[PDB]
Amino acid sequence: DFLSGAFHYSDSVNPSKYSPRPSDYFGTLPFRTSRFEREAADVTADYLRKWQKAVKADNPERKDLVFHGSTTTLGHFVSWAYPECIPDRVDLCTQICDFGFYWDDVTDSVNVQENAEITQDLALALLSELTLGQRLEPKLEINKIVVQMLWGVLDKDRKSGLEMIKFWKGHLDGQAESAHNMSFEEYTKHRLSEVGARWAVEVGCWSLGINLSREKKDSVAHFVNKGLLAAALMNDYYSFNKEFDEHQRAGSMDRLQNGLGILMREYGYTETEARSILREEIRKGERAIMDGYIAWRESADSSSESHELNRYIVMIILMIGGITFWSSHASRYHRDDLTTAGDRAM
Amino acid sequence: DFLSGAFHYSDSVNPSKYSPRPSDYFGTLPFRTSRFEREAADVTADYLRKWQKAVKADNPERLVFHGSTTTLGHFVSWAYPECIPDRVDLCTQICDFGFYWDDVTDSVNVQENAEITQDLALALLSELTGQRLEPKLEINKIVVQMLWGVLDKDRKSGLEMIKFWKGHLDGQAEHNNMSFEEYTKHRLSEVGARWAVEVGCWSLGINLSREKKDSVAHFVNKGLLAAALMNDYYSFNKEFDEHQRAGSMDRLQNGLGILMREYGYTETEARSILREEIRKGERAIMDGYIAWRESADSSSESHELNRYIVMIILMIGGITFWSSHASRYHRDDLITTAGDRAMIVG
Amino acid sequence: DFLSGAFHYSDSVNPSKYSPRPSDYFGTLPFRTSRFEREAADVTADYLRKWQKAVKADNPERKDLVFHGSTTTLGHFVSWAYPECIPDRVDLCTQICDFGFYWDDVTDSVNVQENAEITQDLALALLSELTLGQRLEPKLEINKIVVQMLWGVLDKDRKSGLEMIKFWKGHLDGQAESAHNNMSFEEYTKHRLSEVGARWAVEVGCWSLGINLSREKKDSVAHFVNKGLLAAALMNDYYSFNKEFDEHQRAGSMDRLQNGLGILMREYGYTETEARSILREEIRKGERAIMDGYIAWRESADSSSESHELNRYIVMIILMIGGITFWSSHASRYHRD
Ligand SMILES: CC[N+](CC)(CC)Cc1ccccc1
Ligand SMILES: CC[N+](CC)(CC)Cc1ccccc1
Ligand SMILES: CC[N+](CC)(CC)Cc1ccccc1
Ligand SMILES: [Mg+2]
Ligand SMILES: [Mg+2]
Ligand SMILES: [Mg+2]
Ligand SMILES: [Mg+2]
Ligand SMILES: [Mg+2]
Ligand SMILES: [Mg+2]
Ligand SMILES: [Mg+2]
Ligand SMILES: [Mg+2]
Ligand SMILES: [Mg+2]
User: Fold this and answer.
1) CATH number assigned to the domain comprising residue B321
2) Cis bond leading into C138, ω under 30°?
3) Which of B308, C19, C39, C105 has the smallest CB count inside 10 Å?
C-alpha cells in the first residue's frame, strides 16, 4: 500500500475499528474516513425527504418509497468513498452520490421504455449546462431536483464540475444500452460503461479539487481501469441478492446486470461457484491498480503535475477501498426484507 | 381565445385598467363586467342588513360578513356579466345569501351544520312539489321571499336552479388526510359549482335541455374544478384563521392543506402546484370549448349551448378576478401568519 | 416599519397599484384605502351641490362656484386619510372634511376684515356646542350648515365630538392670525402648524375611528406626533403652492399667502427647485420622526386597554399623514389645470 501524499481531512482506518463487523468483507485495498461523517449523514437524511417528495409527485399511486443510500450503521458512503473531500464540498458531494443511488433505483428495474423516457428527461438538465443555448427544464420531479444541484457544483469549481457533468452524461448513455443480458468478456465491457465508475472518478476530481489534463488521466488508465473493473464485480457480488428480488419482483430479469447472473446462467456454475470466481477477479483487479500505482510512482517526475497525478490515483485506489468496505454492510444491499439462494438458483 | 356570441349587458375589462390593482391575479380566462355593477352593490348593502337582522335573531349572544362588493367591482357583475338587468337584484341576493350561509355552516360542527342544512332544505323542497313545510331559523327563513321572486321571473329555470341548490345542500354534508385525487372529487361536489352554473342559467335566461348540458360536462367540469382550487388558493389564509380560533382545525379541508399534509410540501411549494393545476383546468375548459365549436352546427340548439359554455367560461373568469382582491379572503384582521400555517407541513 | 393592530374597514395599498400614476409622490409613510369609498364619494357629490347653494345664497353676485374637494380620479380624501373610519361615521366624516375644504377656500384668500366676519360667525355655531347656556346661531348660510352636522357628530359620540369641536374652534383661532407672511422659516413653521388644521384633523380621526384616549396620554406622544404634523403641513405647502399663488394673485391678497415654499422663495430667494428640495427634506425628517417615535414607543408599551388605544391613536395619525400625502399628490384641488 503505502499511499503517498498528505491527507488533510481524513484518518487511516480498518475494519477492526468497526463493530459489529461486516459479515463478509474481503477487500484488499486500504481506506480512510473523513472527519465529516456526521455532516454527510445529516445531508443524506434531508436529501431523502426531498427525493421522496419528487418520487411521490411523478407516481402518486406507488407507496414503497424505501430508498437505501449513503448512510449505514457504521458510517457513510461519502466519508469512505471520498475521504479527502473538501469540507465545504461534502454537502454537494453527498447529494450527487445519493441522487445517483436513488436515480439508479427507479431506472435500472423498469422496462427499457420507461427507462428511455426518464434517461432522456435527465440528459436535458445536464446538456443545459454544457451548451451555450438556453435551458431546457426536465418534466419529471425526480430530474427537476437535479438542476439546483448542478449550479451548486459549478459554483464551487466550474472546470471540475463541467467535466464531471460530462462523464455523468456518459454514464447515462451506458445504462441506456442495458436492454439484454452476453458472454463474460462481453459483460465485463458492458458493465464498466454502466456502473458509473468513470463518473464516480470525476465526482472525486470535483470533490478533491483535482485539476489535470484528460491526457494525464488517460496515461494511467490501463491499470486504473483494472481497479475500476474490480469495484464493479465487487458491486455485483454484494448487490446480487437484492437485484434478483427486484428484477423478479418487477419482471425485468431480462435486463439484469450482475456477474453472478452471467456466471450462474450461461455457464452452469452455482451461487457459491460464481461467487468464488468473482472474489478472485476482484483480487486480480485490486492488485493491478495498486501495482500499477507503485510502478508509476517510482519512474516519475517531481513536477507539480506529477504530484497532482499521484493525488488522482491515490484518490481512485482509496475510493475502491472505501466503497468495498461500504458495500460490505450497507442497508442498500444487505436488507432483511428480501427471494433466497435456492430461490435464485432457478 | 375567442368567445363567440354577442354581449348585451356587459363590457370587457382588463386586469390592468383596474385601480387599485390586485396584488396576485394570474387567471388565464377572460372576464367581463356588467354595466349594472351599481345596482348590485346597492342590493348588497341592503341585503347585508337583512342578513344581520336574521343572524342576530338566530344567535343573540355573539360578527362580520364579506359578500359580493369589493373596492373594484361586484361579484355578480363579474361572475354573471350577462345577467338580465332586472334579475341582478335577485342574483345578488342569491350569491350574498350563499356567501353568508356558507360562513355560518362551514365553520361550525357537523351537528350544527346538519341542523341548518336540514332547515334550509325544508324551504327548497317546499317549492319543488304538496304542502309547504316552512323553515324555522331566521337565516333560512329569508330564502322564501327570494324563491318566489326567482320563480316569478322564470319558473322553468328557477326550479332547475332550485334542484341544484338542494343538490348543493347534499354536497357540503360530508375526511382530512384524503389524497389530492380523492379531495378534488369531494371538493367539486361541495363547492357549489353546479349550483353556481344554474344560477347563471337562471340569470341569463338559458333554456337548454339537461341532456344538452351534460353533453359538454366532460370539459366544463374541468374549469369548475379549476375554480374550486382557485378558491382554495385565495381563501386558505382566512380559512386557516377561522378554524384556528374555533378549535376546529381538523374540520378544514383545502387543496393547500391537503398538499401540505399529503406530501410534506411547504405552503409555498403547495401554492405553486395548485397554481399549475388551476391553469391546467382553465386551459382545459377552453380547449374543450374550442373543440366543441369546431364541431357545432349553426342552429338554435347550438346557439344556446354556446351561450351556456360562454357563460361558464366568463363565470370562472370573473370570480377569479373577484377572488383576487375581495375582502372575504384578503381581509387584514387575521391573528395567524405564514409561520403558523407552516405547522401542518408533515 | 410595520404598523401593529387589526384593520377592520380598509385594505393596504401603495402607489404601484395605482394608475394613472401620480407624477410627483415621495411619501415614506404607509397608507390604506377604505372599503367605503362608494359612500364617501356619494356624500361628496351631494354636499357640493348643497354648499354652492349656500354660497350663492350668501353672495348672489358670486360667479364661479367651483370648489375642489375630497374626491379624486383615484380615490377619496376620507378613504385614504381616515381608512378605519367606522362605516356609519363615513357620511359625517365626509361632510366635516369637504366643509373644512370649502370653508378654507372662502376664508383664507379674502382680506382679513372679511375673514373675521366669517370666522366670528362660524365660531357662534361651534361655541354653542361647547357651552350649556348661551345658544347663538350663525347668520351666514355657509355657516348655518354646521348646526345639523355637529348634531350628527355629537349624536354618534358626544365625548369624541366635543373634543373634535374644541380643536375645530382652535383651528378658527389659528387662521384668524394669518394676516402677513413676513416671517422667518422658523416663524412660519410654528404659525403654520397652528393654522393648517392638523390638530383638528387628528381629532376628526379620533371621532371617525371612535378612539377613547385621555388628553394626558395623547400629550405623552406629542413630541414626535407633532413633527409628523409639521411635515404634513410642509407637504401641503409643497403641493398646494401653485394653486394658492394663483388665487391670492386673483384676490389681491398676496401678503396672506401661507406657504413654506413661498417663504423660502420670497424671503430667502431660493428657486422653486431649490425650495422644493428643501421642503422634501424637511418632510422626510418629520415623516421619520413620527415613525421612529412610534416604533420606540411601541417597544416599551404594555398591553393595557389604555395602550391599545394609544397605539390606535398613533397609527391613525401615521396613516392619516400617509393617506393625505398620496391624496395631495394628484387631487384636483391642487393639480387641476
Ligand atoms: C448512478 C450510478 N451510481 C453509481 C454507484 C449508482 C449505482 C451513482 C454514484 C455515482 C458515483 C459515485 C457514487 C454513486
Ligand atoms: C362560492 C361558494 N360559496 C361561497 C360562500 C360557498 C360554497 C357559495 C356560493 C355558491 C355559488 C355562487 C355564489 C356563492
Ligand atoms: C383647513 C382645514 N382642512 C384641513 C387642513 C381643510 C384645508 C379641513 C380638514 C380638517 C380635518 C381633516 C381634513 C380636512
Ligand atoms: Mg441498481
Ligand atoms: Mg444499474
Ligand atoms: Mg449492483
Ligand atoms: Mg364551503
Ligand atoms: Mg367558507
Ligand atoms: Mg374556500
Ligand atoms: Mg387653502
Ligand atoms: Mg387656509
Ligand atoms: Mg397650502
Assistant:
1) 1.10.600.10
2) no
3) C19
